[PDB]
Design a protein around this ligand. Structure first.
Ligand code: WEN
Length: 134
């Protein structure tokens, strides 16, 4: 047993709040916001040694990142941003920072009851995305 045991699994989106505004703040254009906002992704989290993999799969896009905590990596996001990302564990929360074009967004993933809660923040705009086990 280890670092991320309670995150591992297959998770499905069950609720979203303020996601459109988050995507506007990030710079996502109209058509992508509409199609991406309709998606109902599954998030699949696995661990092998020190390497964590997070997949997002939906009718919009399928994405996958693999990383070591605290070790920066280049990421192409589902909306096609080229970002430099770093993911750390801070008090049991996975904290994922993306930097690009002098901008920054922070995405927190936490276990709360039987849910995996994803909080997406950019400047003053937050979106909360709630996932349950598949
Ligand atoms: C943190 C994050 O980012 C996204 C993006 C990249 C999807 C495509 C449109 C722009 C945002 N969704 C989420 C939320 C989630 O995975 O549920």
């Amino acid at each position: 047993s280890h670092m991320c045991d309670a995150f591992v699994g297959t998770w499905k989106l069950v609720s979203s709040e303020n996601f459109d505004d988050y995507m506007k703040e990030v710079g996502v254009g109209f058509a992508t916001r509409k199609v991406a906002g309709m998606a109902k992704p599954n998030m699949i989290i696995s661990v092998n040694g020190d390497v964590i993999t997070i997949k997002s799969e939906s009718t919009f896009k399928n994405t996958e990142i693999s990383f070591i905590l605290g070790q920066e990596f280049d990421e192409v996001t589902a909306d096609d941003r080229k970002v430099k990302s770093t993911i750390t564990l801070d008090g049991g929360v996975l904290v994922h920072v993306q930097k690009w074009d002098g901008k920054s967004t922070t995405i927190k993933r936490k276990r709360e009851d039987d849910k995996l809660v994803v909080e997406c923040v950019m400047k003053g705009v937050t979106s909360t995305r709630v996932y349950e086990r598949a």
